[PDB]
Design an enzyme around this catalytic site. Structure first.
Site, mmCIF file in Angstrom:
data_model
loop_
_atom_site.group_PDB
_atom_site.id
_atom_site.type_symbol
_atom_site.label_atom_id
_atom_site.label_comp_id
_atom_site.label_asym_id
_atom_site.label_seq_id
_atom_site.Cartn_x
_atom_site.Cartn_y
_atom_site.Cartn_z
ATOM 1 N N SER A 24 0.787 -1.235 0.000
ATOM 2 C CA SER A 24 0.000 0.000 0.000
ATOM 3 C C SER A 24 0.819 1.286 0.000
ATOM 4 O O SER A 24 0.243 2.365 -0.129
ATOM 5 C CB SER A 24 -0.973 0.027 1.183
ATOM 6 O OG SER A 24 -2.066 -0.821 0.921
ATOM 7 N N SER A 29 -6.179 3.757 3.589
ATOM 8 C CA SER A 29 -5.652 2.671 2.760
ATOM 9 C C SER A 29 -6.774 1.905 2.055
ATOM 10 O O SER A 29 -6.708 0.691 1.892
ATOM 11 C CB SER A 29 -4.781 1.719 3.596
ATOM 12 O OG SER A 29 -3.773 1.112 2.788
ATOM 13 N N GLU A 89 -5.173 -3.500 -7.031
ATOM 14 C CA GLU A 89 -5.554 -4.156 -5.781
ATOM 15 C C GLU A 89 -6.528 -5.297 -6.095
ATOM 16 O O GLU A 89 -7.383 -5.146 -6.964
ATOM 17 C CB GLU A 89 -6.231 -3.168 -4.839
ATOM 18 C CG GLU A 89 -5.342 -2.015 -4.395
ATOM 19 C CD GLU A 89 -4.267 -2.441 -3.417
ATOM 20 O OE1 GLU A 89 -4.251 -3.633 -3.010
ATOM 21 O OE2 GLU A 89 -3.451 -1.569 -3.051
ATOM 22 N N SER A 101 1.057 -3.299 3.895
ATOM 23 C CA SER A 101 1.362 -4.657 4.313
ATOM 24 C C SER A 101 0.893 -5.654 3.275
ATOM 25 O O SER A 101 0.028 -5.346 2.466
ATOM 26 C CB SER A 101 0.757 -4.950 5.683
ATOM 27 O OG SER A 101 -0.639 -4.811 5.617
#
Length: 260
Positions: A42, A102, A138, A209
């Site tokens: 991220s 995030s 993502e 992460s």
């Protein structure tokens, strides 16, 4: 001996630690594996947000453009976007959500608006960053497979680029200030770099992460009576299902800022 301390921290942790600190008072640097690639996870969201801010420099209407959020837009972590299904969010709101919470849907919307991951990469090149590469969206950009060059950068490259974005010449003043405001409002970084620093310092950061216990944070730090520091801490492990280790980032930050 900062080197010895980082090496011992790394050895005990059982992973691979990458650190780059730039002290803007004298442009001195503390580097540890700063030339090695790590999966960004991220922390790459900062580059996508910045790419949209750069666009806004020539298009005064851009940031207020509205984007429709539908149920199908949602990926695996959407704390802000899920509150707006069937409604809309401006590009500025997507920037905020991507950085401060995030939000993964917000990231994907920003990438789609720019025209794809290769467009974020071209933005990075235009800033003189020849290391950064974004390859996927993502949530797959978080696989963080050892030796996989996709969606990686080095700690030094990211430190230099973050310095340029927040304190330097990458963005016009209004846009630079907006990015900094977003980073300072981050809600996800309490246990990371911030936890290793004096409480009164002002910090803007973006965590990341992923798999392989990959645990990252990049930060701009404003001490009370000194010029800003730029700090990147990347950490990854050999087992795919390893636990994330925010405490390792806090420990590394404590080590390299011991002296301010």
């Amino acid at each position: 001996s900062v080197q010895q301390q980082l090496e011992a921290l790394e050895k005990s942790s059982g992973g691979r630690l990458g650190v780059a600190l730039i002290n803007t008072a004298d442009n001195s640097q503390i580097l540890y594996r700063a030339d090695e690639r790590f999966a960004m996870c991220s922390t790459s969201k900062v580059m996508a947000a910045a790419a949209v801010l750069k666009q806004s420099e020539s298009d005064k209407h851009l940031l207020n453009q509205r984007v429709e959020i539908k149920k199908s837009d949602l990926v695996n972590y959407n704390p802000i976007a899920e509150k707006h299904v069937n409604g809309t969010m401006t590009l500025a709101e997507l920037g905020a959500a991507a950085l401060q919470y995030s939000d993964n849907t917000a990231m994907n919307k920003l990438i789609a608006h720019l025209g794809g991951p290769d467009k974020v990469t071209a933005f990075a090149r235009s800033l003189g960053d020849e290391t950064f590469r974004l390859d996927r969206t993502e949530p797959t950009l978080n696989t963080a497979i050892p030796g996989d060059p996709r969606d990686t950068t080095t700690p030094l490259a990211m430190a230099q680029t973050l310095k340029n974005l927040t304190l330097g010449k990458a963005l016009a003043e209004t846009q630079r200030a907006q990015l900094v405001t977003w980073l300072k409002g981050n809600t996800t970084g309490s246990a990371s770099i911030r936890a290793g620093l004096p409480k009164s310092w002002v910090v803007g950061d973006k965590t990341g992460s992923g798999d392989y216990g990959t645990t990252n944070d990049i930060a701009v730090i404003w001490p009370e009576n000194h010029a800003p520091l730029v700090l990147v801490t990347y950490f990854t492990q050999p087992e795919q299902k390893a636990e994330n280790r925010n405490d390792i980032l806090a420990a590394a930050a404590k080590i390299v800022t011991h002296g301010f």
